[PDB]
């Protein structure tokens, strides 16, 4: 019944499950070194947040530089665990990698919405694609209220209102 400590806070991803990983240990927020970052290592971090399995594991903190101190280094893991700290660790707190080597992980569901035409990858009129489990798919036609379209246009940032073209 606590907020607890050491929760893998994912930020800069734009969703609930994406971006860099941050850990609040000994009262300090910190990133994770990318030394020998493994996809099997990315499986546990996704499971702890309840997101699911892992799709990609990215290094060099391309999601974003982490200002905080580096906490763990050279983490490898069996991939089947519930507590992140219980992963094969070369010690604690001491790192051979500096910042710009922070780790990033994409979990099972980081959904992205795009408006696509043949000419433009992102345009303001076209088809509706949804990102799920590292894949792109069309959206259903049946039972679309005017409010349903209204939200899609607002999220994509094209217009306040929108309309369905039959063509």
């Amino acid at each position: 019944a606590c907020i607890e400590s050491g929760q893998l806070r994912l930020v800069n991803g734009g969703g609930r499950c994406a971006g860099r990983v941050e850990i609040y240990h000994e009262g300090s927020w910190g990133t994770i070194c990318d030394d020998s970052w493994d996809l099997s290592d990315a499986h546990v971090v996704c499971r702890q947040l309840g997101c699911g399995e892992a799709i990609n594991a990215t290094g060099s903190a391309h999601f974003g530089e982490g200002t905080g101190p580096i906490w763990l280094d050279e983490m490898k893991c069996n991939g089947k665990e519930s507590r992140i700290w219980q992963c094969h660790s070369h010690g604690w707190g001491q790192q051979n990698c500096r910042h710009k080597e922070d780790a990033g992980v994409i979990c099972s569901e980081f959904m992205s919405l795009r408006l696509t035409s043949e000419a433009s990858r992102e345009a303001c009129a076209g088809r509706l694609e949804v990102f799920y489990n590292g894949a792109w798919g069309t959206v259903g036609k049946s039972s679309m209220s005017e409010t349903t379209v209204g939200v899609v246009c607002r999220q994509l940032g094209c217009a306040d209102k929108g309309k369905i073209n039959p063509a």
């Binding site: 070369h90 010690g91 001491q94 051979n96």
Partner: protein
């Protein structure tokens, strides 16, 4: 692995980042070359604070020349010897006779430096040293005298 910042007075005052156990082979050990590179000893002197000045290079001993030899070079030589600065510079060869091979090195030193190897040395192309003009020194022996800007 050392991580010294550069201004440490000693190596023991250095942040050390110890990698886990594991080493390279013995063939990859390192060696450093500091700039002192010169050995000066007083020879044929009745007391330790004075003697004929010799420097060793190319695996041989030879005496310095009084030509282009001034008082401050004796002073900094004394400071290295820790006898205290030379009260007076001896003239001629009153106690230096030997080592017919004479190095022509002449030392241009301001005297502020503490070790005579530090002050710049130019010797390439120097003219031949006349005989009996071998340099020397007569240090104070007080050990309580220090150089001062301007006896």
């Amino acid at each position: 692995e050392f991580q010294c910042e550069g201004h440490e007075s000693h190596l023991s005052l250095c942040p050390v980042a110890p990698r886990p156990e594991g080493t390279c082979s013995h063939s990859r050990d390192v060696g450093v070359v500091c700039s002192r590179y010169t050995e000066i000893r007083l020879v044929n002197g009745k007391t330790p604070c004075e003697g004929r000045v010799e420097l060793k290079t190319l695996g041989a001993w030879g005496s310095l020349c009084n030509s282009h030899w001034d008082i401050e070079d004796a002073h900094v030589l004394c400071q290295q010897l820790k006898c205290g600065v030379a009260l007076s510079t001896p003239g001629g060869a009153r106690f230096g006779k030997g080592n017919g091979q004479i190095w022509r090195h002449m030392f241009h030193c301001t005297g502020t430096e503490q070790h005579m190897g530090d002050c710049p040395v130019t010797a390439l192309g120097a003219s031949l040293c006349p005989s009996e003009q071998v340099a020397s020194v007569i240090c104070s022996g007080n050990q309580s005298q220090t150089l001062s800007s301007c006896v």
